[model samples]
Target chain A: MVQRVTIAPQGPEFSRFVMGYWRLMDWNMSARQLVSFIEEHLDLGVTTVDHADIYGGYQCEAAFGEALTLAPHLREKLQIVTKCGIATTARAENKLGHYITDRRHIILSAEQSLKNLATDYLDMLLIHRPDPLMDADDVAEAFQHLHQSGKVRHFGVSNFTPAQFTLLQSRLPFTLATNQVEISPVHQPLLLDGTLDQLQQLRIRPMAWSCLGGGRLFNDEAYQPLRQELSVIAQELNASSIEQVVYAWILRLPSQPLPIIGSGKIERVRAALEAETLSLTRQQWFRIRKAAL
Target chain B: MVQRVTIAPQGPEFSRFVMGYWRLMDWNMSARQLVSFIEEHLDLGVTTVDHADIYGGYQCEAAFGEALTLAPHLREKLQIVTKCGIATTARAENKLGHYITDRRHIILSAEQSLKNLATDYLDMLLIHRPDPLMDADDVAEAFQHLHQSGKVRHFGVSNFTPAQFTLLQSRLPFTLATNQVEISPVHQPLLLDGTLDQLQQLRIRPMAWSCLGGGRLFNDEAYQPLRQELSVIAQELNASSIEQVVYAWILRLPSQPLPIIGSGKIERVRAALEAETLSLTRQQWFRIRKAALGY
Candidate 1:
C-alpha cells in the first residue's frame, strides 16, 4: 500500500515516497529498461519523480526523455519534478561554472529543461541551491513568467536557509510549493537550525533529499548505534528491513516530510513501499534520534 | 606629461595610464625588485594599481603585500583597486570551483584580500564579473556592510554588460564608480554595445582592462595591418612606440577611458606614460580603424 501527501499549495498530491531520478545515472539502462523501471515504481504508486538540470552533468533529463519517448503513456501516469540554476563543467562556456538563479538563467534553464525532458511543462521546478548572488525580484519575475507561460506548474527551492527562502518567497506572487532539504537522522541540522520548524509553521511540507545519507545510514560504522536501534525497532514492529524503520521514524514528525528514495534496483524500491505501512511510536522515534546523536 | 582622470564618481583621480598588476607573475621579482618596480610606476605618475583576488591563482595580492611590507611608504603613494567574486581552483575545498557573490563570500573574500594586500582598506572593490546567480539585494547589502565597516571606500564592477551592471546598480545606495571592461582598437565590442555610452551618460569613467589587447595588438600576425598603420602614425607623430599610439587611440574616445597598462617592465611602463603626451587626429585614427576592418 502507498499514501499520498499534498506537496504544494493547491497543488497535486504526491506519494509520500518520491522516486529520486538522480540514480538513473547508475543504472545505465536502455530506453526500454528505464520504461520498465518507471512502470515498476508506478505499480507501487510512487508517482512523483525528482530530477535536476545538472544531474549526470545535464544528461539525466535527456536520458529520462528517451525512456519517456519509448513509453509516452507513462508521462500521464506520473508527476515530474526537476531543478535548475546549478551550472556544471559539462559546457565549454562554463569552464569556471557556478550556481545561477538570476531571471535570465532561471527562464533559460527551465526552457532547456523542457527541451531535454521532451515535455512541454514540469509539474514542479526548483532552484537547485541558494545562490549567493540571487535577486528575489528576478526570481519572482522568472517564476511568474514561467507560470503564465504554462512552462512550470509550481516553484520551490532546494538547500535554502530559512532567511534565503523567506527573502525570495516574500517577493513571489504565489505561495512557494516546498523546500527540498537534507533531513536524515545522521544529517539533522535542520532539526536545530529552524528549517523544519519554519516549514512546519508555514504549513508547507518539506521533501528530504539524501534521506539515506547517500547509504551512510547502514554502511558507515559510526552509525552502528543507530542501526542497532533501528534493528530493535524493526524487530518490535516486525518490519521487513532497517530502511523501513528509518522511514517510519521520519514519517513520525509533525510536518509529514516526504523522503526521496534513490534506489535503482526494483527489489530495493519495492521494499521501500513497505515503509509507509510501518508506523513509529513517539518512544521509538525519539530512541532512534537519541542513538544517532 | 602624465594625465589623470576621476576613476569613479566622488572617488580619487587615477593616472590615465593605470598600471595593471596582473603581470607580476611574469616578473617574479624579489621584494627589493618589486619595490623598485613600484618606484618605476610612481615615477611615471602611474599611481593606481589594478588587481583581482584570484589573479595568479590567489598569489598576486600576497606578493604585492610582500613588496608593500618591504617598502611601506609605497602604500601611501598609490591607490589600490582589486576585484572579487570569481572563485578559482586555487583552494583545495573548491575542487569544482565556481563563482560566489553571496554576502558571506563577498565579505570573506574582501577580508582575505585585505590581509593579502597588507592594507586596512582598499581604495575600491569591484565584483570581478557579473554572476548569473547574483542577488541584487544581497550584493547591495554586502556592499553596504563593506562600506559602513570601512573595509572598502568605493564599489564598482568589471566585465559586466550594461544590463547586468544596471540590475546591480539599481539596488545600491551609492553610485557605481567605474566599469572595468576590455576595450582596445582590436577588441571594440564595448564601443558597439553602448557600454561606453551608458557610462558616459551616468557621468562615470570606465577603466579599460587589456587595453593593449593582451599584447595581441603587436604579436599576432592577423593584426599586422593595424600594426603597420600604427607604425605609420608613430613616425608621423614621433611617438616613441606603437604601444603609445594605441594608448592614444583609446584615450581619444569622448568618454576618456582609463587604459590599464599591463607591462611588467619599467621601461615599458615609462613608454606607456608617454601616451598622455601623444595626440591622434581624426584622419589618423580612422585610417587605423579602416585598416583593421578592411572596410
Candidate 2:
C-alpha cells in the first residue's frame, strides 16, 4: 500500500503516489470499468487523482465524472486534484493556443472543472503552467474567490520555476501546497536547478509529473545506461520491476517528491503501489542520479 | 497626409497614424482587392500595419501575405508589426489556451509570422500580452535568436503594464521599441496610469490600439458626452470628421501616441491622415479628457 503525505501543514493527506488521470481518456473504459480501475488504486491507498482541464482535449474529467456518477459514494473516499489556466486547441472559442490565469478564466475554469468532475469542491486546484501574461493580483482575486466559495480546498502550481512560484505566492495570504513538475531520472534538471531547493526551503513537498519520463526511460536509447542501472538496483532490492526503483529514487529526494503514477494499466498501478516499500540508500540514489547525468 | 514618427532612437519610422489589420479579415476581399485597400492606406502615408497571429482565427497573416504576393513592391513601402504569445480558441493542436513566450514558442512564432507574411524579416514583433508564465531569460533568448538570425527587425510588447514591460526589457540588451496599448478619448486609463509616463521616460513613443475606442466614440451612449464635445473641438479646428479629431486627441499626448486606425474604408484612412494636421491645444485636450470622466 502507498503511504500518505500531508500536502500542507494540517492540510489534506495525499498518497505519496498520485494517480495521474491524463491517460484515463486513452483507456477507452466504460463508466463501470473506470470505477473498477479507480477502486483498484483506492484499494492500494492511492487516493489522489491528478487532472488538468485540457487533458484529452477537455474530455477526461467528463469521462471520469460519468464513472463517479455510477459510484457516487466514491467521491467522498477520493481526493480530487484538477488544474486549469491552459486552454488547449480542442476548444472552438479559443483563437490561439494560450494560457490564461486571469480572474475570469481561472474562476470559470474552476467552475467548469467542478462541473466536469461532478464534485461539490476540489481537494486541490493548480494553474497548469506559468503564463507570461499572469497578473498576480488577478490570480489572487481568483484564488480568494475559490477559497471563500469553497470551490477548491487548496491551491498550487505546475511546471513553475522557483521565481515564478514566489512571484504568485507573494500575492496570496496562504502558502501554496506543492509545485507539480516534470521530474524523472531521465529528466533531472530540478535537482540542479533551484526548483527543488526552493520547495525544500519553503517546507513544501513537490508532485513529480512524468516521473517515468513519459515511459521514455525504458525505451529511449539515451536512457539505456540509466535503465540498466535501475534494473540492477531493483534486483538488489528484490523489487518486482525497475519502475519501483525509479519511484523509490524520486521519493528518496530530500524534498520528498510525490511521484504521480501515469499508467492506465492496473498492473502498472500495482507496481507503483509496491514501489512505496522500495527504499533507496544515499549511495544507491547518487548512482542512479549519475547514470542520468 | 499622415506624418511619421521615430519609434525609438534609431528604429524605423512608423506613420503617426498606423493601420490596424485585425479587421482586414472581415473585409473578405480577394488578394487583388486587398492590395487596392493596402495601397489606399499607403496613399495616405499610413504605412505600418498591426496584426496579431490569432486575428481572423489565424487567417489574417496568410491573407495579407497573398495580397503582398500580388504586389511585392508594397512590402518595401510599408512596415509590418505582428504580435505573438496569445494562443486563442481557434487552434486544434494546443491542448490548452495559453500564451507561450518560451524560447521555442517565441522563435517558432516569429518563423511562422515570417512565413505567413511572405517576408524575409518583419519590421517589428510584439508579445501580444504579458504572460504570467513568461520567463525573462527565455524571452530574451528568443529575441536574441530572432535578432541574430534577422527573422525580425525589432521587438516590442502589447497590453503590458509598466512593471511587466520593465521586467522583460531588463533582460534584453536593447530597448523595446514601443508599448502598444488601448488609448482613446473614451478609454484613457494610461493617462492617469504610469504606462504613458514610463514610455516617455524611456524615450520610446507608445502605439495606441483601439484609438477610436473600437468605433464606440460615435455610437456608444457612455461616450456621447465626449463625442458631442469632440465635434465642437473638430469644428473649431476645421477638421473634416470626428475621427480626425479623435486621432489628433491621441497624437496630442506628450508621449506622441501613434494611433492605429481600425477602418478598412479608404475615406476613413484619409480622415485619419487629416488628423496629423489638426493640432489640439492643451486646454482643448483636457476638455475632451474631462468630458470622458464627467468630473
Candidate 3:
C-alpha cells in the first residue's frame, strides 16, 4: 500500500504518490468511468489528486467536479490539491500570460477554484508560479483569510527561490506546506540549487511536478545517456521498467519529495507505486544523476 | 593592489586576500623575519591574517604573537581572525582530540587568543567546527559576552551545514559573519552543495580554506584532470600559472569566497593577488568543472 505522509510538522496528510489531473479531459473518461477509477485507486490507498485551475485550459477542475457530482460520496475519500494565480487564456481577458498574487486576485482565485471543483474546501492551494513583483505580506493576508474561513486547508508555492521562500515564510504564522517544482532527472536544478536544502531544513517534503519530464524521459535524445543508465539500474533492482528507476532515484533524495504521476494510464501509476518499494543505494542514485548530467 | 571587503554588512573589514598563519612555525622565520613579510604584504594591500589556536598543535597563535610583539604597530593595519573550540594535546590536559563549545571554554579561548595574538580585540572569531552536542543559545551567549566586552568584534562558524548555520543564526541577534570551509577544485562539494548557496542567499562571503586542495592540486593523480583544465584556463586568461587560475576559479563563484593564501612565499601570495584581476566567462567556468568531473 502507498503510505500517507504528512508534508510538514503542521501540514496535511497526503498519499506518497499524488495522481495529477493535468491531462484529465484528454483521458476521455465519462463521469461514471472517472468515479470508477477513483474508487479503485482509493482502494489502492492513493487518495491525493493534483490539479491546476489552468490545467486543461481551466476546464480540468470543472471536469473533475462533474465526475464528483455523479458520486458525491467520493469527495471525502480524496485530498484535492490545486494551484492558481496564472492569468492565461482561460477566459481570454488578458493580452498575455502573467502572474497575479495580490490579495484580491488570490482570494478571487480560491473562490473560483472552489466553484469549479464543486467543493466546500480544498485540501491544499498553491501559487502556480513565482511572481517577481509579489507583495509577500499581501499574499500572507490572503492565506490567513483563506485558512480562517476554511476555504483552503493548506498553502504553499511553486518555483520560488530560497530568498523568496524565506521572505514569504517570514510573514506567515503557519509554515508553508511545500514548494511544488519540476524535479525529473533531466530537470534537476532543484537538487543542488538550495531549493531542496531549504525544504529539507524546514522539514517540508516538496511536491515534485513533471517527475517524468513531461514524458521526455522516453523520447528525448538528450536524455539517452540517462535512459540507458536507468535500464542497467532497472535490471539490477529488478524494476518493471526504466520508469520505476527514475521515481526511485527521485525518492532517494534526502529532502524526500512527493512525486506526482503525470499520466492517467493505470500501468504508469502502478509503476510509480512500485517504485516506493525499490531501494537505491547511494552510489546507484549518483550513478543515475551523473549519467543524466 | 588587492581590494578590501567587509564580510557581512556589520562584519569587520578585511583585505580581499587573507594571509594565513597555519605554517607560522614551519616557515623558520624569526620574529623580525615574520615582521618583514607582514610589512611587504601590508604594503601590497593584504592586511588580513587567519589563525586557529590549534594550528601547529596550538602554538601558531603564540608564534604569531611573538612576531607581533616585535612590531607592535602592525596590529592596526591588519584584521586578525582566529578559531577555537577544539580540545587537544595543547597542554597535555586532554585525554584525546575532541570538541568543546561550552560557554566557559569559548570565552576562555577568546581571552587566550587575544593574549596569544598580542591584540586587544579580535576582528573576527570563529567556532572551529560544529559540535554535535551544541546548544545554539549557549554559543550565542558566549558570542554576546565576547562582543559586549569588546574582546571579539564578530562571530561565525566553520564547516557547518545549512541547518546548523540557520539554527545558530536563529539564536543570535545579529547575523553570523561568514562560514570557513575547505574549497578547492578537488574538494568541490561546497560548490554544488548547499554550503555556498546558503551563504550567497544570506549575502555572506565565506572564508575558503585550502583553495589548492592542500597541495593535492599539483601532486594528486586524482586531480590531474583538474590540473590540466587549470593549465588550459591559465593560458586563456594569460594568468601567471595554474596557481592563479585556481584562485581565479574560486573567486568566480557567486558567493565570492575569500581565499586564504596558505604559502608564506611572497611570490605565491602575489599570484593570488593577480588572479583577482582575471575574469572567467560562464562557459569557461563550467568547462573547468566538467574536466574536473572527467566529462
Best candidate (score: lDDT): 3
Chain B TM, every candidate:
0.96, 0.96, 0.96
Question: Per model, how much of the real contact set is kept?
Answer: 0.00, 0.00, 0.00
Better of 1 and 2 by DockQ: 1
User: lDDT tens string, model 2, B135-178?
Assistant: 98999999999999888888999989988998998998888999
Best-performing candidate as measured by DockQ: 1
User: After aligning candidate 3 to the native by TM-score, how far in Å is the CA of B129 from where it should be?
Assistant: 14
Stretches off by above 4 angstroms in model 2 are: B1-295
Candidate 3 lDDT over A1-293, as tens digits, reads 79989998789999988988989889998878888888877778889999988899888899899888888888898999999888886677887889888998899988988998888999999988889889999999999999999999998988888888889989999989989988977887776556776776677889898887887877788777768889998999999999889898888776688998867777677777999889886557656766776
Model 3 lDDT tens row, B123-177 = 8899998654455667888999999999988889999888668867877888899
Which lDDT tens digits does candidate 1 get at residues B1-295? Answer: 4677786678777877788888788777887898998898888788989999988888999999998998888898888999888876687765445667778778888899899999899988999986544556678888999999999989999987775677677778788999898987788778877789998888888999887778788789888877888899899999989988888888888878988887788888888878887779999888877776677
**Model 1 steric clash pairs:** A133-B133, A133-B134, A133-B135, A134-B134, A134-B135, A135-B135
DockQ of 1: 0.03
Compute each candidate's TM-score over C-alphas. 0.54, 0.54, 0.60
